[PDB]
Amino acid sequence: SMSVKKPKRDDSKDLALCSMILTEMETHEDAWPFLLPVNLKLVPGYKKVIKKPMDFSTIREKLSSGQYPNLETFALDVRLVFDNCETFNEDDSDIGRAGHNMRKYFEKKWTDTFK
């Protein structure tokens, strides 16, 4: 509350560390469905169904231009990528499997770097 604060957790390395995680996600062999925005002209149903599209290149641009206020807003966008994938793709598909794999990969790196 006013003039009453918990001890200050050091967040000075968060930007660099989120960048490193994102690099590891970009270079994963199963990243290909997620590297670029879904083409809304060429994929029927996507525009109407997926209210907030997100992809790794869009996260990289937001990160590089100070559009994440803190590490939690960064994790919310990475999770959005996988939530969108599960919304549009069957589990038993190459893309559906890719999204589960990448979400697992992310969640471990996130715990090990920050928790």
From Swiss-Prot:
Top-level taxon of origin: Eukaryota
Domain Bromo: 9-113
Expression by tissue: Expressed at varying levels in several tissues, whereas a smaller transcript was expressed specifically in testis.
Entry's localization field: Nucleus
Family statement drawn from the similarity comment of this UniProt entry: Belongs to the WAL family.
Function in brief: Regulatory subunit of the ATP-dependent BRF-1 and BRF-5 ISWI chromatin remodeling complexes, which form ordered nucleosome arrays on chromatin and facilitate access to DNA during DNA-templated processes such as DNA replication, transcription, and repair. Both complexes regulate the spacing of nucleosomes along the chromatin and have the ability to slide mononucleosomes to the center of a DNA template. The BRF-1 ISWI chromatin remodeling complex has a lower ATP hydrolysis rate than the BRF-5 ISWI chromatin remodeling complex.
Assembly and interaction partners: Component of the BRF-1 ISWI chromatin remodeling complex, at least composed of SMARCA1 and BAZ2B, which regulates the spacing of histone octamers on the DNA template to facilitate access to DNA. Within the BRF-1 ISWI chromatin remodeling complex interacts with SMARCA1; the interaction is direct. Component of the BRF-5 ISWI chromatin remodeling complex, at least composed of SMARCA5/SNF2H and BAZ2B, which regulates the spacing of histone octamers on the DNA template to facilitate access to DNA.
UniProt protein name: Bromodomain adjacent to zinc finger domain protein 2B
Organism for this UniProt entry: Homo sapiens
Lineage: Eukaryota, Metazoa, Chordata, Craniata, Vertebrata
